[PDB]
Design a protein around this ligand. Structure first.
Ligand SMILES: Cc1ncc(C[n+]2csc(CCOP(=O)(O)OP(=O)(O)O)c2C)c(N)n1
Ligand SMILES: O=C(O)c1cc(O)c2ccccc2c1O
Ligand SMILES: O=C(O)c1cc(O)c2ccccc2c1O
Ligand SMILES: [Cl-]
Ligand SMILES: [Mg+2]
Lengths: 538, 540, 530, 155
């Protein structure tokens, strides 16, 4: 059929545009481009990943995109796919992840009597349809240009080539119920759009006592490298002057440089809201955040005058040392192993070149409390909406894409490690992400570390964790589950081991099966007291 | 003086209880703490039964089960962000099955939308046209002078949510998105500084009383014309059609005692069809409903009427019948029904290997009156209809809305909990009625996390899940090889009793008194299924 | 002071700090708090307020006020059909990238679904047509949170302005700013003045968004035989000024080598440089649909047009090498002379007066510094056919969707905003002229735009030339102008130039009878003469 | 092909009680069938230049005697111009059928209308012309039922 020629042209243009991975699920109707994707997979031009669970498939695609920075397609095949992909599409929108959602509508069928929800109108960068492929035998040159131009538009919108705001894209290729026209020479994309430079310099005086708060999506800024910096784990670091998050309330910054989108630490929110502290927002795309409407100016880079006062740098470094010491000393003086102990052990075990995947809740916070040095490390976390859903498949896709990048450099060395640190509720939410068929790509160096305190530890640290709610907070916030994690991994044929926090390090230096789950049992009944002891030791 | 979030949550929870809500599913979060606190106290005082789950998606199907088990509206309460998005699949199913599901989502204040605030998304309107209504409560204001007026607006909006979900005025029940923006303080103030919840109407009545509506649309039908009835999901009960030959899907309520096997329909020539509810299961029904020659009369309980037939001469709610079926027609239909039943019975016995059709037949023969049968929406529902189950006296549930694989375990669990709950309230000292679920291995593995019930949460008292495990176009490469998951290992991970048994023991094991919740795994073969179905067709 | 007044006054002050000089208001009870704060700023001279009855025509007035000088413009109306009436102007503002802020007053969202009067689903009505749908939080009685509410109110307003002006996206367009308002809606007694919570010092906006630059350079070899096609929204490119250029009347001209659109089908360029969004000429669309000629697309916003399928590359500027071959330049110049002569000679030979004659007369009478406003259908085409030289004059047309809606109000708004910027340079010269060319059908359809209350600002030098070919109704144009008390005259095409040379008598309508029965024969003579 | 689609739908609308149709001049077949039906006296056609006024004319034609009325959009400014009339018809429960034709937008349609039904492309194939007849008339009957509130009591 002429629609097969269409599918082969689109898959080819997608591959020319940098797509190396596509996720599919089996469905009622044939997947969009399902056979052209089958052809491309057997040739090794693209790599296919199949899953039954459409929600975990969406989050696998997110992992495959953030693992190495490439656009990733997901092929919708059912009337439950839109609903199940919603979570991943929302996360793609807010974390600016280039996610292409492929659909195949049927224009000859009656409508008003793909099960559509309301989020496509709000979450996607673009919604493009290809139009019905006809058998026009002479217009093949024109239809090739039309299909490839539309595919280049889909890729440009998903990667933010013109907007500098990557995100999810809905790509519809309509199908009527049932020799490839060539592309540009040298495998180039049909419509070349050079990745745009989006520039907006801001004047900032660094002699004013300044702290840098960098969050998810922050850029790298060499002219700010000397400033004291509270950097979230997923922020790429510019300098060598880290400021511990717990030291921040011991200081009085006179101005704040906010890089990207911060979401962690109530002390950071308090400082960003303080109407007496000017906040300069520096972002990489057009979006910029505002805490209590306190943002004074926006920009993409700083034009700096002056330099930080040496006494200011000394004050920040002193408060930083007190914070590091309090955390280390109170961890040692605490008998029960908690999630914070696990995060410190994981943090000490990382090596340059590693990839770190962090779940929401305490893990992404605990790693910052443990003072992880992220330089040389690639840190991922679904900070767009901070969901605890889909983190297992995100780590798997990230491990697969990160390994594929290393394999393509032809290095004879072993694939770099991907270490994931997630909580137990996070693991239970997306345990079905462990179900990978033998026919499907499986990571070769993925270790999932599950810090298991049989519930949600973070709620012990919030207002609902105050002792006056002790008789009611167990069911509705603690949420104990008593799941046998080792038996769960066994059911899915995944290597699993329960180890103690002191064994965690050594067990991680040892290579193992391509995919394994290390579970560390932790306590959350003493979490609130441990954090109070840290604050008192500051 | 209670803080505004606490006052609003307690009023809303109280009005939901007054509206018939007996069960609430809660998923943990911080932003929904006001709702969580108010719900925990209502559960402590016995006004509702709270079910806590970790995975919002399967929690939504738990709520569907809790609603179809006894017909009541059910709320599911979750925090802001992707937690709300995870309710999508259950919302879609609740829409098409007309299930009164209330998605009670906490939110950040709407003014934070667009600011980059953590865990904030376009929640209101997320579900689009799938919901019967998207209703937002206002952000609660600290205005003790306006407390009485705010009580009236909060309770009135809650009643509109309930009415829209139950179809109290539209006769078209379905899901409703109830979004509640909430700001700090989120936890109740110290009880020294305490106050009473702004009161509702006296005598536990709803703020706005909507008497359940009667929706009537009479239709004239002459039964002297050779007529077959095809009843699907949502079909009504029609005593004046009880004598007609009736092809009834397992979930359809039976109007009479004149069944007609689905395999018999293509071998007969009805001159007119009466279609009840939303029938989608059988292919010859779909083939015959596509026949432009046969006049089709559609009778629905609500204003939605199915589009399966293109020659629907008329659509109503009841039949005003004239005439009577010619006795030779009834004899021909009855004769062909017995012929179909015998062909299935013989070919099943003549088939050597145990198949899913054999497990479905064994479960059918083990059912007694008063049982609840929950069927996976894929093969189980078709196999039970092929094995000719008599559904009179048993309640049959199936997520026939979109017939997805998601949430079948949680639906079975929820249906069992609501079914047993209604039996308690009868005060009967009789033991809790049995719920039997029949699902395939791939469905069981997909929603195995639906088995996760926390140690403090309600567990069904008499639920048995029978898993027919047969270990099962480039997307279909995943089925060529077996998934290879151990059902027993999955049940141990979720601390669920499981046994691997054979089809001949299935009957007796099901007769054993209920050990709470258990999984009975019966191995089967799919390789020979194509030959078994071919043998049945040739025997007709 | 009631919170709905303090909220309205903070928003208006921040809008003013953000460059809003003109606001269009429609009467209603729900937008009363905005109306009072807007009348206050109009009294003190901070903005110029314009009141209209019809909200649809009010939207096109704000579009004219926006395109006349390039500033963001708000339109404030009441709840109900008023917002739905802004639909047509929001669609036009979207596709033409016009910074139009729709400031809608609404009953509290809690009243949605309760059967309240004049209450509808307003938030999200415009859907995908707006760059942002932002809502302010319902003003609460909390003086202890006044400073907090100030910051959030002024940050939201700055976010509204940035989205409308494309300050960080380079994609200007309409924004929905919905304000839920409850009673009391009028200002309480304000003896000895009330303190509005202040903005930043020195009139600076709350959040400072410095100028942004989107850069996407493309390598283009000018030695290849190149034609430039510039449409609506095109930027200015010095390094392309030597190339043959087919420029729509609204396109800013970068050079001095014009190529008539009629000459383009006489040429075979080897590559095309396309600027902005060209939609006007059929030979342009034919060339762009030729998948054998490579097209380079140079745009100012991230939106790049799709009229071409052989789009090789899209960017913002060209890095050029080489120079156009002299034989290519000579051939294009010769084809251009062919086209211009064919149009001029055949117009001079035609015995009747057609719309093409009216358009050519209006072109001849234009002087540098003039503003020309064109009805987006036939007038834009006829002026392009007549060969109008647009250098030194600012040409405006609702080229977004090219509807007949609101052309009169757009010309009125463009004239006012254009004259206002001429008063801003302190120059003692008389107000520069605004000449509008519209067809009779367009004029009757938007004749209600002529309704301007005695107190509202009236243009000082606006002349609307109506080309009346009785269809493009039997309505009397002069009778329409008398109902609205606007000066009108029926004149001949020979009298057009001299009558336009008279100093502007405020607002006047010049009606020129034209024939359309002989049009097809005039066009055939032009095509045959090429 | 598409011409036959237009005749069947027009005929079914008249069978459903539509006695008046408002259309506005524009580019966007169906106008031909309505023209045949007007020349034959089965339906009364009303033409207006202003699309907003056309919507309010149709509202009047519907509330004048209680019948369903159709309005035929034909341009890219039609959806926005019919907005005010559609909102009025929503809240006043007026049976207003809005006829469009896309080639295989604002957010108000998703909030204001009782239903949104697309007929589907007309495939040249007289082997199933009887089934295409039933599918078109069935969907047209669904549109009339949704507009008049025949099953919901909510015109
Ligand atoms: C999809 C989703 N549902 C609910 C939440 C609310 N939430 C935030 S943290 C948390 C607990 C997570 O527990 P766990 O993974 O065990 O981590 P811990 O904090 O105990 O280390 C929950 C439910 C969320 N972020 N995302
Ligand atoms: O900088 C980023 O990466 C970023 C990402 C986002 O999704 C935002 C959403 C709203 C507001 C600001 C945002 C932002 O600054
Ligand atoms: O009775 C009616 O005619 C009527 C009509 C409407 O459009 C309503 C809209 C919202 C709420 C109540 C409504 C109502 O009672
Ligand atoms: Cl040439
Ligand atoms: Mg935990």
């Amino acid at each position: 059929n002429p629609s097969t020629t269409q599918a082969r042209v689109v898959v080819d243009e997608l591959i020319r545009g940098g797509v190396r991975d596509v996720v599919l699920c089996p469905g009622s109707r044939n997947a969009p481009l399902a056979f052209a994707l089958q052809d491309a997979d057997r040739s090794g031009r693209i790599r296919l990943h199949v899953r039954i669970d459409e929600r975990t498939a969406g989050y696998l695609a997110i992992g495959l995109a953030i693992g190495a920075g490439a656009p990733v397609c997901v092929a919708m095949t059912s009337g439950t796919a839109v609903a199940n992909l919603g979570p991943a599409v929302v996360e793609a929108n807010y974390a600016r992840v280039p996610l292409i959602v492929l659909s195949a509508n049927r224009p000859y069928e009656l409508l008003g009597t793909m099960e559509q929800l309301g989020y496509f109108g709000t979450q996607v960068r673009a919604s493009i349809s290809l139009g019905l492929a006809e058998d026009a035998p002479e217009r093949t040159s024109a239809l090739n240009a039309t299909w490839r131009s539309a595919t280049c538009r889909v890729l440009a919108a998903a990667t933010g080539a013109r907007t500098a705001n990557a995100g999810p894209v809905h790509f519809d290729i309509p199908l009527r119920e049932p020799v490839t026209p060539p592309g540009r020479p040298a495998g180039k994309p049909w419509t070349y759009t050079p990745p745009v430079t989006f520039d907006q310099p801001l004047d900032i005086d660094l002699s004013v006592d300044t702290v840098v708060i960098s969050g998810h999506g922050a850029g790298v800024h060499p002219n700010l490298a000397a400033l004291p910096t509270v950097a979230e784990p997923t922020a790429p670091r510019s300098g060598d002057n880290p400021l511990h998050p717990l030291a921040l309330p011991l200081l009085r910054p006179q101005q704040v440089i906010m890089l990207g989108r911060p979401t962690l630490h109530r002390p950071v929110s308090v400082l960003l809201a303080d109407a007496e502290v000017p906040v300069f927002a520096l972002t990489t795309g057009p979006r910029w955040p505002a805490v209590s409407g306190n943002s004074q100016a926006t920009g993409t880079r700083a034009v700096t005058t002056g330099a930080p006062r040496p006494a200011w740098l000394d004050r920040c470094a002193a408060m930083n040392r007190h914070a590091i010491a309090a955390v280390r000393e109170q961890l040692a003086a605490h008998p029960l192993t908690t999630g914070l102990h696990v995060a410190a052990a994981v943090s000490h075990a990382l090596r340059p070149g590693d990839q770190l995947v962090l779940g929401a809740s305490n893990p992404v916070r605990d790693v910052a409390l443990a003072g992880l040095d992220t330089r040389g490390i690639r840190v991922r976390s679904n900070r767009g909406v901070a969901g605890i859903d889909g983190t297992v498949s995100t780590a798997i896709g990230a491990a697969l894409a990160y390994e594929g990048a290393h394999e393509r450099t032809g290095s004879p060395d072993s694939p770099p490690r991907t270490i994931a640190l997630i909580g137990d509720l996070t693991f239970v939410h997306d345990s079905s992400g462990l179900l990978i068929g033998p026919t499907e790509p499986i990571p070769r160096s993925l270790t999932i570390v599950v810090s298991n305190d049989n519930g949600g530890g973070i709620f012990e640290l919030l207002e609902q964790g105050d002792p006056r709610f002790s008789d009611v907070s167990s069911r509705i916030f603690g949420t104990p589950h008593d799941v046998d994690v080792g038996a769960l991994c066994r059911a899915y044929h995944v290597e699993s081991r329960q180890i103690e926090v002191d064994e965690l390090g050594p067990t991680l230096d040892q290579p193992g099966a391509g995919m394994r789950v290390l579970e560390v049992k932790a306590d959350r009944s003493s979490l609130r007291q441990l954090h109070a002891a840290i604050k008192a030791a500051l």
